[PDB]
Structure 1
Amino acid sequence: DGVGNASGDWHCDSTWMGDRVVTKSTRTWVLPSYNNHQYREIKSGSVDGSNANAYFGYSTPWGYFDFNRFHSHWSPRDWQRLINNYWGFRPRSLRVKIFNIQVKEVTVQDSTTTIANNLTSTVQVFTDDDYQLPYVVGNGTEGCLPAFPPQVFTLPQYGYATLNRDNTENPTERSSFFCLEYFPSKMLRTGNNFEFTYNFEEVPFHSSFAPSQNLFKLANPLVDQYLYRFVSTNNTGGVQFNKNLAGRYANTYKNWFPGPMGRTQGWNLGSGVNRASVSAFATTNRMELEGASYQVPPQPNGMTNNLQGSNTYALENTMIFNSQPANPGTTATYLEGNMLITSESETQPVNRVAYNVGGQMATNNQSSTTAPATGTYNLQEIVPGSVWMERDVYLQGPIWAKIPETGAHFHPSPAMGGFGLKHPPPMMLIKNTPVPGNITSFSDVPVSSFITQYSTGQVTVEMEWELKKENSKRWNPEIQYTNNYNDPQFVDFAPDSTGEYRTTRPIGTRYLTRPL
């Protein structure tokens, strides 16, 4: 339309309408001109003594919008309203809007650096709707819409790794290059706006409740089982049985089993002595792939990293966030006091404890001459009639992940939590259209001098979520997420005296309970 008319309005809200809730968020973004308008091939060799660190890829001059964190859509208080009242939820639709664009030209003649706005410049924008480009959004990386609405953010630069050859920096004949200018995009001048809608594919509700019963003790403690059990042999070797009594859960027959587990190492937070001067890496859990060794946090779903009322944590089975945002490439050594360490202790009635052995079993064949022997195991995968709880979602965590296209997968639920999607919300890429400097003669060699500039604008995301109403018959009152602080020095989830947003705790999702 025009220069003196606004292309959209500010919307931040939450509208609860029974079975649905609609969240809206608007933020102000700024977009730098990345790479100075060109593609570069980026690469690395073996860094920090690990060739799993090697890669080969491309950085592009595009930036993208990333809103795959819950705090980008939920306020602390609406999150509390959700986890204290519902049993589950899932995303239904998405609507995005980019508007009020402003391109600024920057000129640094004689160290004066003046910023003027360029009314005729454009930004290009497109969404990759067929998933033809490497999807980098759901991998726990930075650059999402901020938690707090008044914050202004920088869009991150799009880049991707393709195939490297033999754990070195070199490409292979299969490494691909994707040119993003090879997709159709819209061009927007200062009076233009971009709009985009999306519907999620039917996914299972997240389970925002904790189990009120232990999986191995579902039998009625008042009645005995009509099943018996082998309990020994007499002085001659003949077998003897005993009836499974009422409430002797250590012996009853079971119908269901706990989920898969792979033992992780346990460390003590706060009080609780640990081995001094250790170097985690050398002894962490790894998986090999293409000849290299990778750490695999947070480990696959089906375990619990903490046992309620204990300070031992299987740290690599844990999501660890920082209480605040950090600068790029920081190598500082943070301590427990700076972190937001999550705990999955409310799944312990169903998920095995990560730092303990998973059980034991027969190692030999007993005979008149050999005594029965058993041996414990450290890992155990899926068996039939197995049940576990998926990892929890936090307000500061990720909403979805793309399920990789390979044609074969098992139980597509991402290790970091959230929804696993075949076709997730498409990537939205954006860049400042290049504007050439003063060029006076002809050359077949591509132009390399540009006017420096950047853009800024507003972005609105509108998500509809479907809720699963809590339907309990528990008599006594439940546990609820509550604002409880002893002698607060500042309000949590609010700006402090400096104006910086504070958050002292990770807020999970399981407060309500249910009988198994």
Structure 2
Amino acid sequence: DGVGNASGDWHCDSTWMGDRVVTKSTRTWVLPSYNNHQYREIKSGSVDGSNANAYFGYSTPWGYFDFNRFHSHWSPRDWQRLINNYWGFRPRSLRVKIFNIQVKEVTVQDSTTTIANNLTSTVQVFTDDDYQLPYVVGNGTEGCLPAFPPQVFTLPQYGYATLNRDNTENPTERSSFFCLEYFPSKMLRTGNNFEFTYNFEEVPFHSSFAPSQNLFKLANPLVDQYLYRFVSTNNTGGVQFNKNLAGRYANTYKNWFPGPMGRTQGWNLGSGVNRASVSAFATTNRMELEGASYQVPPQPNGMTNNLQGSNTYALENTMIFNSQPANPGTTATYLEGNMLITSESETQPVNRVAYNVGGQMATNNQSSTTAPATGTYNLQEIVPGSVWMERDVYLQGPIWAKIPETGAHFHPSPAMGGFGLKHPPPMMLIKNTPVPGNITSFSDVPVSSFITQYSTGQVTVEMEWELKKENSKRWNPEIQYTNNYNDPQFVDFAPDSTGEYRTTRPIGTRYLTRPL
């Protein structure tokens, strides 16, 4: 519309209406003119002693809007209301608006650097609706809408890795270059705005409850089974049997089995002792791909990284967040007191402990001359009649991930937790349209000098979430997430004396309980 007329209003709120909740989040963003308006082939050979760090790709002059983290939409109090009252939830729709665009021109005349807004300049915006570009959004990276509403953020630069040759920095003939200008996009001057709507595909509810029963003890403890078990052989070798008694869950016949597991080194936190001076990398779990070895945190779903009351943690099977955002590219050493370390203990009644053996199988054929032998295993995958709980989601964790397009997959549930989608919210890309400097003579060579500038504006994201009601008959009170602190010096989830947002703990989702 015009220079002196706002193109949108500030919407931040949450509205609960029975079985649905609508969250609205608005934030102020800033967008730098990355790579000075050009694409740059980027790459890397081995780094830190691993050719898995090798890659070939491109960086683009584009930035993107990422809102794939629960805290970008949920305030702590709203998150508490959710996890303390519902058995599950799931996203249904999404609406995004970008408005109140302002383009500023920066000039360093004799070192006084003045910032003046350029009224006739534009930004370009488009969404990759058909997923024709590498989808970098569901990979746990930085640059999402901030958790605290007043915080202004910088949009991350869009870049991607394509195929690299023989674990080197070189491309292959199958490496692909994607040109973002080769998509239609809207051009906005200061009076214009941009809007976009989307609907999520049908996905299962996240399970925000914890088993109030152990998978191996579903049988009635007051009744014996009508099934018997082999317990030994007489002095001759004639097999003998005993009836499985009531309560003897060690022997009861079972219908269902725990989820798959892959042993993951257990470490001790707080008041726990560990092997000193160890360098983690060499003994970490790995998976080989294209002739290289990669660490695969947090490991496939199916296990619990820690037992309730225990201080042992299968750290590679854990989601570990920082209690605050850190500078980019830092190599500083962090200790437990600076980290938000999550625990999947709610799942222990059905998910196997990650730092223990999964079980044992028979390793030979017994005979009059050979005693039966057994052997433990450190990994077991999916078997029929298997059941397990997916990783929990957290206020500071990711919401969804794109299921890779290959034509085949099994149980597309994202390892980092959340919702696996075939058609996730599309990439929303934006960039500052280049404005050429004083060019006075012709040349068939592409212009190189550009007036330096950056853009800023607001962004609103509104999401509707469907809720699954709690229909429990438990008589005694349940566990609830509570604001429990002792002799506080500050309020958690609030700005400090300097205005920095403080969050001392990760908030999961499983407080309510349900029997199996």
> How far apart in 1 are the matches of 2:337 and 2:468?
36
Note the C-alpha offset of 1:214: 0.2
- Quote how far apart the aligned CAs of 1:485 are: 0.2
Aligned-pair CA distance for 1:462: 0.3
- Give the Å deviation of 1:100: 0.1
Unaligned 5+ segments in structure 1 are none
Matches of 2:289 and 2:180 in 1, distance apart? 29
Question: What is the count of residue pairs matched by the alignment?
Answer: 516
Q: Take 2:283 and 2:244, find their aligned partners in 1: how far apart are those partners? A: 42
SS at 1:506's partner residue? coil
CA distance in 1, matches of 2:234, 2:454: 86
Q: Matched residues in 1 for 2:457 and 2:361: separation? A: 62
Q: Deviations over 1:309-332 (max 9, x none)?
A: 000000000000000000000000
Offset of 1:509 from its aligned partner? 0.1
Q: How does 1:134-173 map to 2 (within 5 A)?
A: 134-173=134-173
* Deviation of the 1:374 alpha carbon: 0.3
What's the CA shift string for 1:122-171, capped at 9, x where partnerless? 00000000000000000000000000000000000000000000000000
CA distance in 1, matches of 2:14, 2:368: 73
Q: Distance in 1 between matches of 2:206 and 2:276?
A: 40
Q: Aligned equivalents of 1:125 and 1:101: distance in 2? A: 12
TM-superposed deviation, 1:366 = 0.4
TM-score (norm 2): 1.00
- Aligned CA RMSD, in angstroms, stands at 0.2
**How far is 1:260 from its partner?**
0.1
Which SS does the other structure have where 1:101 is aligned? strand
CA distance in structure 2 between the aligned counterparts of 1:483 and 1:344, rounded to whole angstroms? 20
Match of 1:230, SS? strand
Provide the C-alpha distance between the structure 2 equivalents of 1:230 and 1:208, rounded to a whole number of angstroms: 40
User: What CA distance in whole angstroms lies between the structure 1 residues aligned with 2:447 and 2:258?
Assistant: 63
Per-residue CA distance 1:169-192 (angstroms, 9 max, x = gap): 000000000000000000000000
- SS for the counterpart of 1:52 is helix
Classify the secondary structure of the residue corresponding to 1:387: coil
TM-score, normalised to structure 1, is 1.00
CA distance in 2 between counterparts of 1:419 and 1:361 reads: 35
Counterpart CA distance in 2 for 1:479 and 1:419 is 25
Q: Deviations over 1:397-436 (max 9, x none)?
A: 0000000000000000000000000000000000000000
Deviation readout 1:453-506 (Å, 9 max, x if unpaired): 000000000000000000000000000000000110100000000100000000
The alpha carbon displacement at 1:261 in A equals 0.2
Task: State the distance in 2 between where 1:89 and 1:346 align.
Answer: 18
Deviation, structure 1 residue 70: 0.1
What residue in structure 1 maps to residue 233 of structure 2?
Answer: 233
Give how far 1:379 is off: 0.2
Q: Structure 1 CA distance, aligned partners of 2:191 and 2:397? A: 35
C-alpha deviation, 1:103, in angstroms: 0.1
* Alignment partner, residue 404 of structure 2: 404
CA-to-aligned-CA distance 1:358-407 (integer Å, 9 cap, x gap): 00010000000000000000000000000000000000000000000000
Structure 2 unpaired stretches of 5+: none
1:339-366 CA-to-partner distances (Å, cap 9, x unmatched) read 0000000100000000000000100000
Secondary structure in structure 1 of the residue aligned to 2:484:
coil
Q: What is residue 14 of structure 2 aligned with on the other side?
A: 14
How many angstroms does 1:37 deviate by? 0.3
Partner of 2:80, secondary structure, is helix
Deviation of the 1:195 alpha carbon: 0.1
Please state how far the C-alpha of 1:212 moved relative to its aligned partner. Answer: 0.2
Distance 1:91 1:252 in 2: 41
Match of 1:214 in 2: 214
Identity of aligned residues (%): 100
Instruction: Supply the distance in 2 between the matched residues of 1:202 and 1:273 (Cα, whole angstroms).
Output: 46
Secondary structure of the corresponding residue to residue 502 of structure 2? coil
Deviation of the 1:61 alpha carbon? 0.2
Deviations 1:187-231 (A, max 9, x none): 000000000000000000000000000000000000000000000
Q: Output aligned runs, 1:66-465, within 5 Å.
A: 66-465=66-465
Distance 2:268 2:107 in 1: 55
The residue matched to 2:495 in structure 1 has which SS? coil
